[PDB]
Amino acid sequence: YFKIYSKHTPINLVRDLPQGFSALEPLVDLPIGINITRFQTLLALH
Amino acid sequence: ASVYAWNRKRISNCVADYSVLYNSASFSTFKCYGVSPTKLNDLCFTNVYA
């Protein structure tokens, strides 16, 4: 079951992940049962 | 399904008369483990596969 979580915030550190506490709420759980071992992130353009 | 491939999918949100699965006569070719069929309509399930 594909479980998805998130958090969103403004930041100062342009390079990298900041120090200090954060924890993510669940966006969704999906019934989908997929054999997952690889992935890629995506952009879009006109 | 083939015995090395199965039909495993998530039944969710639903209701049924689960007692049909043992009380309907031609189903009388069965078993249960832990749980018992007469209790199933009062037992709150969660999600189901087969």
UniProtKB/Swiss-Prot annotation, chain A:
Origin: domain of life: Viruses
Glycosylation sites: N35
Effect of mutating A23V: In strain: 20A.EU1
Effect of D16G: In strain: Beta/B.1.351
Subunit structure, interactors included: Binds to host ACE2. RBD also interacts with the N-linked glycan on 'Asn-90' of ACE2. Cleavage of S generates a polybasic C-terminal sequence on S1 that binds to host Neuropilin-1 (NRP1) and Neuropilin-2 (NRP2) receptors. Interacts with host integrin alpha-5/beta-1 (ITGA5:ITGB1) and with ACE2 in complex with integrin alpha-5/beta-1 (ITGA5:ITGB1). May interact via cytoplasmic c-terminus with M protein. May interact (via N-terminus) with host bilirubin and biliverdin, thereby preventing antibody binding to the SARS-CoV-2 spike NTD via an allosteric mechanism.
Role noted for this protein: Attaches the virion to the cell membrane by interacting with host receptor, initiating the infection. The major receptor is host ACE2. When S2/S2' has been cleaved, binding to the receptor triggers direct fusion at the cell membrane. When S2/S2' has not been cleaved, binding to the receptor results in internalization of the virus by endocytosis using host TFRC and GRM2 and leading to fusion of the virion membrane with the host endosomal membrane. Alternatively, may use NRP1/NRP2 and integrin as entry receptors.
Name the record gives this protein: Spike protein S1
Species per Swiss-Prot/TrEMBL record: Severe acute respiratory syndrome coronavirus 2 (2019-nCoV)
Underlying gene: S
First and last residues shown, out of full length: 200 to 245 of 1273
